[PDB]
UniProtKB/TrEMBL annotation, chain A:
Pfam families for the chain: DUF447_C, DUF447_N
Residue stretches making up the DUF447 domain: 13-121, 130-186
InterPro entries reported in the protein's UniProt record: DUF447_C, DUF447_N, Split_barrel_FMN-bd
Name under which the protein is recorded: DUF447 family protein
Alphabetical keyword list: Flavoprotein, FMN, Nucleotide-binding
GO molecular function ontology, one term from the record: nucleotide binding
Positions that bind FMN: N27, P30, G32, K46, Y48, N50, R51, T52
Source taxon at top rank: Archaea
Amino acid sequence: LRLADFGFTDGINEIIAITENEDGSWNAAPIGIIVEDSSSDTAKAKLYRNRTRANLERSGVLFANVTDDALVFAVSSFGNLNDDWYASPNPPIIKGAMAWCRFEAEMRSGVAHLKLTDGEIIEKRVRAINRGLSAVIEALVHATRYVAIKSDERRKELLERIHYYREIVQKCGSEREKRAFEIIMEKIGE
Amino acid sequence: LRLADFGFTDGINEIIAITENEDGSWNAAPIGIIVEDSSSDTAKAKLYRNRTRANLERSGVLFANVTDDALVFAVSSFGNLNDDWYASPNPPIIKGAMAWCRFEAEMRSGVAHLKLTDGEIIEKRVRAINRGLSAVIEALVHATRYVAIKSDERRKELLERIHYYREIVQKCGSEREKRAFEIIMEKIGEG
Ligand SMILES: Cc1cc2nc3c(=O)[nH]c(=O)nc-3n(C[C@H](O)[C@H](O)[C@H](O)COP(=O)(O)O)c2cc1C
């Protein structure tokens, strides 16, 4: 199998990582899958102390959903998705996803070493470049840092970045990106 | 026709605007097409005094190519594509474009009032979100401004943003985004 056949390129691919909880329910969270060669079946992801890492340590199985849905990224950055977000429970396939794939994973020093074993394209799409989508994704990077730090000066700097990206989403984004951004603002206490 | 059927959403859609020069050749430049209702056939673009605007004043015809190709954006940001970038000379499709559209355009003091009249979906695709692609697009916004202005304080601000986005492209982008960023650095005098 080739990573490129499921929407991955070399570089870092921001996807929704779906992993099985101990009770059999799914956990969904954004992660960046790092790819050196998209013609290959190997990749990796460096994971923080979160449910994704805890599940992969136990199960060694990671599903990925390839999606450009700002809302799914915003919600899953701050909490789990509910069953209502899924079009399919097995394999797990969030509504609106363009593709899914399955990786076997081996954790070493906080890095999930991945081997692609299955997947399918669900829906190819066309969308013009949208800076509002870019802005939601960047804001998520800063907001997730913002909530993890106590420094008032560092937080001030991050909030300025978040406001900068908010102006872009308000000007450029579709209603879906604007909705996603309001989730970010709510979650961080703004 | 409906804008949504050719890849446009409400908001601003960054596309490649292709317009006819005085000599019949094509001019290509990134432009944002502003959409209030993607179910409709109407849109707008706000244009500075550039070749796209001058060409629309003469012809009232705007072709749009919907593409996610970082290299097409970077090259067209700083000049014309010429003739090797096109899969079709008429209607102008750029190689790799996902869709093309044709708009009638009425210029009203820098605002192009657009009506969608023709178009085709060429190729639907799938690509995971990539922050390197985001960063190329942001850097192009700042770099096209940088090269057009003389303010020292403003150029200083813009160069800082460009350097910030460069780091994101190096970390996250594919080789295609990296190649696109190399064009930016060359064009701003940091090659
Ligand atoms: C993503 C992006 C969007 C842009 N949108 C616009 C726009 O909507 N209106 C405008 O006047 N310039 C816009 N620009 C700047 C022009 O593309 C740039 O100045 C170019 O040199 C104009 O070329 P032309 O003289 O061939 O029209 C945009 C640039 C980027 C990279």
